[PDB]
């Protein structure tokens, strides 16, 4: 068993958008759990259902790393039982979530002088997402009776809105990279031991 590729998840140069968040499966490796929280760069470390100090003595079947970028003021919405735009239309965590949410400020990378429009979030949706559901469709949103025919007009809106990211924005409007580690332990033999 080799080392788990947590470094690729956390030190990736480019992170996904919150509506198209990346997920990486991790199994059959030795995990440096207690070594993940060694730097002071993490400005949000919140575990639900597992103690971060008990990870090194726990064997799991799978570890799923869901990575994306959101706004600072929206980092509070990455948690079970949260509501809002990110929680309802972009990324939803279940009520009985068992994992850890690690978010850090990336104003240096994900924020450009002219505005970084690569990161987008779903602004309109007819219903809230089920847990761990990803919606990437760019269909024009129909808020009225007249069909949109693929063109935005009155009562027809593009569902995805972009965070204009600039280095002058306040900390609540600066980009934050979020990685959610979900630990799955089924009856199958565990292979992601510490």
């Amino acid at each position: 068993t080799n080392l788990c590729p947590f470094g690729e998840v956390f030190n990736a140069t480019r992170f996904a958008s919150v509506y198209a968040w990346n997920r990486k499966r991790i199994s059959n490796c030795v995990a440096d759990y207690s070594v993940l929280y060694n730097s002071a760069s993490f400005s949000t470390f919140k575990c639900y259902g597992v103690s971060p100090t008990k990870l090194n003595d726990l064997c799991f079947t799978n570890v799923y790393a869901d990575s994306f970028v959101i706004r600072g003021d929206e980092v509070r919405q990455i948690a079970p039982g949260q509501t809002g735009k990110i929680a309802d239309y972009n990324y939803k965590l279940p009520d009985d979530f068992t994992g850890c949410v690690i978010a850090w400020n990336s104003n240096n990378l994900d924020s450009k002088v002219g505005g970084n429009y690569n990161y987008r979030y779903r602004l309109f949706r007819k219903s809230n997402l089920k847990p761990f559901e990803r919606d990437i469709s760019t269909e024009i949103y129909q808020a009225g009776s007249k069909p949109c025919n693929g063109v935005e007009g009155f009562n027809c809106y593009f569902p995805l809105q972009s965070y204009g990211f600039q280095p002058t924005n306040g900390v609540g409007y600066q980009p934050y990279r979020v990685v959610v580690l979900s630990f799955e332990l089924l009856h199958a033999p565990a292979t992601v031991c510490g």
Epitope: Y37, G49, V50, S51, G81, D96
Partner: antibody, heavy 121, light 108 residues
Framework: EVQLVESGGGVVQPGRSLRLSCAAS????????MHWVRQAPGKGLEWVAV????????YYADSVKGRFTISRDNSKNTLYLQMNSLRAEDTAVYYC??????????????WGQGTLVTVSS | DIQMTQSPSSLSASVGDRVTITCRAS??????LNWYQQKPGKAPKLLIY???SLQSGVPSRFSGSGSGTDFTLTISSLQPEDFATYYC??????????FGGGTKVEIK
């Protein structure tokens, strides 16, 4: 049988530094996580910080994050809590609590008698 | 965070009565609830962990039940040494442990 004894409290001026200590006995100190939990006078309990069995991981509550520091010495079976830049809200009785260890989540099972810290001038 | 609310905030009962204390969480905390007992001027003592397991050394009259957001602590037969303050704590958010407001049981 578990023994936890707090010491090092008293009256501390606001913004100063105070180090609390907790001596542990009658159990394997180097195999359990250790918590610091404070109770304000006349108020309810409030979890402050936690340290792991090897001392590698230290976690703090939001009100105390970046302001307190929890460490441990397994050779002496001692737990240290350094509080710097104390505010008026920190006046409370501090207890060192042992982690149960039977679950994936923290839960205190044995507490010390606690030491009083009074932030006033 | 997850707010914990205890009902009633204070109650009066005599020796031999059956006492029930309800703890409610703002959101679901699975089964990670702990019940502690604290005497005036003393240190808290763990009674229940994981909302159903009895701590060693605790009298068998103390019981815990519930799930989701609603939990209950039950003392079948109240006794003179059972008059104390009972706290409920959620361990679901392990890095944001929060206690309840307290429930002071008094003598009628």
């Amino acid at each position: 049988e578990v023994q936890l004894v707090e010491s090092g409290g008293g009256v501390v001026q606001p913004g100063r530094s105070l180090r609390l200590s907790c001596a542990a006995s009658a159990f394997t100190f180097s195999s359990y996580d250790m918590h610091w939990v404070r109770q304000a006078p006349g108020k309810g309990l409030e979890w402050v910080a936690v340290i792991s069995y090897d001392g590698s991981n230290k976690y703090y509550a939001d009100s105390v994050k970046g302001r307190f520091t929890i460490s441990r010495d397994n050779s002496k079976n001692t737990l240290y809590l350094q509080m710097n830049s104390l505010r008026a809200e920190d006046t409370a009785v501090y207890y060192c609590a042992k982690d149960g260890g039977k679950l994936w989540v923290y839960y205190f099972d044995y507490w010390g008698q606690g030491t009083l810290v009074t932030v006033s001038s | 965070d997850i707010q914990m609310t205890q009902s009633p905030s204070s109650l009066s009962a005599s020796v031999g009565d059956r006492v029930t204390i309800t703890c409610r969480a703002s959101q679901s905390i699975s089964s990670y609830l702990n019940w502690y007992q604290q005497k005036p001027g003393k240190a808290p003592k763990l009674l229940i962990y994981a909302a159903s397991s009895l701590q060693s050394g605790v009298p068998s009259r103390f019981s815990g039940s519930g799930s989701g957001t609603d939990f209950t602590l039950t003392i079948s037969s109240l006794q003179p040494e059972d008059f104390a303050t009972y706290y409920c704590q959620q361990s679901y958010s392990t890095l944001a442990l929060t206690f309840g407001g307290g429930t002071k049981v008094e003598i009628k």
